[PDB]
Amino acid sequence: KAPEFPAWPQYDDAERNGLVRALEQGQWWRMGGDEVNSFEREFAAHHGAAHALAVTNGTHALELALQVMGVGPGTEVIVPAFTFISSSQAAQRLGAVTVPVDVDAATYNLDPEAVAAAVTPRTKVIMPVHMAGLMADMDALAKISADTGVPLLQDAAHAHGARWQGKRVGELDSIATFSFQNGKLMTAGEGGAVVFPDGETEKYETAFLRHSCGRPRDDRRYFHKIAGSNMRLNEFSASVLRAQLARLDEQIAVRDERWTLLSRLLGAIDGVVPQGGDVRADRNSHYMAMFRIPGLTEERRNALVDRLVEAGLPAFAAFRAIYRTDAFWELGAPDESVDAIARRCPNTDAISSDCVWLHHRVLLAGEPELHATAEIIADAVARA
Amino acid sequence: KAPEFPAWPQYDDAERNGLVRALEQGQWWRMGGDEVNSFEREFAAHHGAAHALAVTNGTHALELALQVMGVGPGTEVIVPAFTFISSSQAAQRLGAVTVPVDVDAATYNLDPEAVAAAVTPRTKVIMPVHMAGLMADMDALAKISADTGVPLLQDAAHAHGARWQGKRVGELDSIATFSFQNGKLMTAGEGGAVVFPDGETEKYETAFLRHSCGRPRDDRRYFHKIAGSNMRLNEFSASVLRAQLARLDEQIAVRDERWTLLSRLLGAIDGVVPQGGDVRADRNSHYMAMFRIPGLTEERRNALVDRLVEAGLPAFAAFRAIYRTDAFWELGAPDESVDAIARRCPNTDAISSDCVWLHHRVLLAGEPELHATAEIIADAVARA
Ligand SMILES: *Cc1c(COP(=O)(O)O)cnc(C)c1O
Numbered sequence: 001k002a003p004e005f006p007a008w009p010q011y012d013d014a015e016r017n018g019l020v021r022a023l024e025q026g027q028w029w030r031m032g033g034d035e036v037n038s039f040e041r042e043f044a045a046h047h048g049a050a051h052a053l054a055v056t057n058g059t060h061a062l063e064l065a066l067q068v069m070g071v072g073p074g075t076e077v078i079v080p081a082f083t084f085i086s087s088s089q090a091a092q093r094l095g096a097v098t099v100p101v102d103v104d105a106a107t108y109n110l111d112p113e114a115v116a117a118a119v120t121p122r123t124k125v126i127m128p129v130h131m132a133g134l135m136a137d138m139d140a141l142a143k144i145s146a147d148t149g150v151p152l153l154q155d156a157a158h159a160h161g162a163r164w165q166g167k168r169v170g171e172l173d174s175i176a177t178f179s180f181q182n183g184k185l186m187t188a189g190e191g192g193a194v195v196f197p198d199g200e201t202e203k204y205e206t207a208f209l210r211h212s213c214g215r216p217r218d219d220r221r222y223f224h225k226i227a228g229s230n231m232r233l234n235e236f237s238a239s240v241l242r243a244q245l246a247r248l249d250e251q252i253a254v255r256d257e258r259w260t261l262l263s264r265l266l267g268a269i270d271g272v273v274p275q276g277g278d279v280r281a282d283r284n285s286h287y288m289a290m291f292r293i294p295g296l297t298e299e300r301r302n303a304l305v306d307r308l309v310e311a312g313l314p315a316f317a318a319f320r321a322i323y324r325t326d327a328f329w330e331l332g333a334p335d336e337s338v339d340a341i342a343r344r345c346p347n348t349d350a351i352s353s354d355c356v357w358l359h360h361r362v363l364l365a366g367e368p369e370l371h372a373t374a375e376i377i378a379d380a381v382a383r384a
Numbered sequence: 385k386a387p388e389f390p391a392w393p394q395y396d397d398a399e400r401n402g403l404v405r406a407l408e409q410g411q412w413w414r415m416g417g418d419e420v421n422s423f424e425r426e427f428a429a430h431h432g433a434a435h436a437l438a439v440t441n442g443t444h445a446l447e448l449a450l451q452v453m454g455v456g457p458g459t460e461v462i463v464p465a466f467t468f469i470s471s472s473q474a475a476q477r478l479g480a481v482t483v484p485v486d487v488d489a490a491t492y493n494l495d496p497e498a499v500a501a502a503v504t505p506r507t508k509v510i511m512p513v514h515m516a517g518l519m520a521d522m523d524a525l526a527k528i529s530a531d532t533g534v535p536l537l538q539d540a541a542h543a544h545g546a547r548w549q550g551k552r553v554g555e556l557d558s559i560a561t562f563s564f565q566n567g568k569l570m571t572a573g574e575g576g577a578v579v580f581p582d583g584e585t586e587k588y589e590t591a592f593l594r595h596s597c598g599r600p601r602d603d604r605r606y607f608h609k610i611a612g613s614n615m616r617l618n619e620f621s622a623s624v625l626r627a628q629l630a631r632l633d634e635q636i637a638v639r640d641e642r643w644t645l646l647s648r649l650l651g652a653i654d655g656v657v658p659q660g661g662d663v664r665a666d667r668n669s670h671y672m673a674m675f676r677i678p679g680l681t682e683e684r685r686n687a688l689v690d691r692l693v694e695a696g697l698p699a700f701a702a703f704r705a706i707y708r709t710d711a712f713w714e715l716g717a718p719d720e721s722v723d724a725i726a727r728r729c730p731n732t733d734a735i736s737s738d739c740v741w742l743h744h745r746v747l748l749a750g751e752p753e754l755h756a757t758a759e760i761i762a763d764a765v766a767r768a
């Protein structure tokens with residue numbers, strides 16, 4: 001009876017040939033092969049960016065981007081309080097302080113007015129996250145950016161192929177980061193990228209250097225110019241990503257027609273409020289199918305999730321307020337207290353307990369499974 | 385005329401099948417597949433360790449090992465002054481100070497007496513590096529370790545499959561790290577590992593947690609316990625490593641018979657002193673075929689290297705004193721000066737300018753190419 005959904009990840013002969021091609025180059029790191037090099041140009045073109053830097057994972061893409069944008073001891077990074085922990089963790093790994101800021105009640109995106117107030121003389125970077133593939137308010141955020149002189153960094157891990165006001169992630173005037181971890185919209189099990197808009201070639205060069213043990217690509221005498229790490233992506237991963245990229249736009253198009261349906265079936269459910277839209281985000285990538293059931297405690301929400309999993313749905317609890325994780329308080333925490341932070345992040349505080357999400361693979365299924373999915377949900381929500 | 389050597393890396397159907405097997409699992413990260421899990425047990429068994437943690441690269445394996453061993457702001461890490469920059473860089477990325485210490489004149493391994501003197505009340509970790517596959521003096525180093533109470537961390541990136549006093553890397557009583565970067569003794573283009581001896585399960589658990597965004601393997605509600613990063617290895621990389629592991633011992637055995645020959649042809653060259661041995665290291669992995677030409681400046685050495693490359697040899701300049709790199713001085717540097725450091729690292733200071741190395745692939749070639757290789761070298765060294 002249980003509605004079945006398409007598998008994720010997906011692959012076919014493109015992946016197969018790709019892995020063979022990478023293998024048969026006889027050189028499996030980016031300095032001897034061409035898959036990473038080629039994936040970078042394809043990825044960057046696809047997002048209209050001037051440059052793309054493929055890296056080990058989306059967590060290190062944030063760490064490297066914050067580092068070339070000056071994050072470090074003595075700085076503050078503004079991040080939405082409702083996101084995946086990597087968004088703060090990356091700043092905190094650099095010695096910076098993470099200042100969590102509230103998000104919109106409807107889109108769950110970083111609230112522009114809340115950021116204007118957290119802005120401080122220490123603020124080095126403001127970091128919107130495009131929640132579930134729906135871009136954040138890059139117009140209002142860019143104004144704040146202009147007025148404070150605090151650059152923006154897009155955490156675009158959920159927004160492969162997304163668009164704001166007809167513009168691509170890489171055509172806003174900010175650096176952005178992506179993840180290619182197994183459950184993301186294109187994947188090689190692990191992987192990430194830093195994409196640089198027009199105008200940021202110097203930061204792009206510095207990032208290359210910092211991601212390769214600070215060694216020039218054709219240094220022969222071990223001349224390390226600057227500190228850093230190794231965040232290089234391997235040729236096999238790159239080749240699977242080149243095949244994944246090629247199906248992305250059509251997968252985002254199937255998902256957009258399905259969200260239109262499911263969003264409306266969800267909103268017809270008593271107590272259920274699906275993520276809101278925004279007409280300015282002309283292209284939503286649909287990384288997650290998210291909805292709130294306002295008023296639920298965390299325990300009722302988790303119990304509703306468990307019941308949804310028992311009926312065959314790939315449903316999950318949404319992120320937790322980052323300030324409600326122990327990891328957040330281990331290092332570089334703000335001098336406010338937990339309730340002081342929660343006081344001024346009321347939407348996060350409720351969304352942290354309220355919100356449910358379905359795997360984006362559900363948005364590739366046919367309409368009838370969407371119908372079956374929303375009945376399963378309607379029943380369960382009456383009993384939550 | 386130019387002697388030809390076997391290719392590196394090497395692969396065959398094992399790699400091919402492996403990549404397909406990984407692909408066909410349909411899940412490409414360690415939480416949904418079994419290649420990383422399986423590579424970890426195989427790798428750990430092969431080194432007699434209790435546990436193995438496969439990670440993105442050998443640089444992050446050092447960073448993660450130093451972090452679970454307490455490295456951080458306020459500590460000092462003792463490392464050989466002649467090594468790859470990652471060895472210090474990792475400590476310096478953690479906020480610690482790197483204290484470079486001299487190495488043996490003959491083996492180029494961390495000098496046990498030099499470390500006893502650099503030892504300080506701040507010293508958190510002493511880090512031998514098994515230069516070119518030849519283990520460092522783990523007996524004398526373990527005594528210093530016992531007397532100071534400063535734990536050892538083996539940087540075993542050059543020492544896959546190596547042995548000290550009949551014991552495997554993982555059977556000494558220390559954590560060790562490896563690299564699987566393209567030119568290493570087994571590779572997937574990129575990759576690394578942390579191996580834990582018997583007795584270190586708690587550090588092994590902490591390291592797992594720190595390498596996966598501080599999230600328990602089957603957390604469902606985003607409970608991040610501790611800070612860290614993402615240093616997870618992907619299933620395709622793991623599967624190529626499982627096939628590489630299986631040829632390692634026989635490749636180390638061919639190399640050992642060839643070094644015996646080449647070492648003696650080299651030592652018969654006027655001015656040429658090949659890396660020395662050590663009978664206590666019963667199994668040398670032979671990552672590099674190294675030799676010094678005492679008295680050469682860096683420029684004569686580099687010119688001799690260029691001439692050796694022009695005759696068809698995969699010859700390189702050896703590492704540079706870490707204290708002679710700009711990267712070293714960018715962060716967490718000691719309060720000594722450059723000449724103060726060089727004063728008390730005289731062997732490094734000369735080896736940094738003196739030493740030449742050939743790719744370990746040369747040690748898989750037949751004897752006749754070793755003979756041709758040593759004539760090419762004899763000629764070039766007379767003219768250096
Ligand atoms: C997945 C994710 C990341 C980090 O990516 P990894 O590839 O998993 O390290 C960063 N930010 C957001 C919002 C994410 O969802």
Ligand SMILES: *Cc1c(COP(=O)(O)O)cnc(C)c1O
Binds near residue numbers: 562
């Ligand atoms: C290669 C190397 C490393 C680091 O490894 P990557 O996989 O290249 O990051 C660490 N230490 C030594 C001595 C090495 O040679």
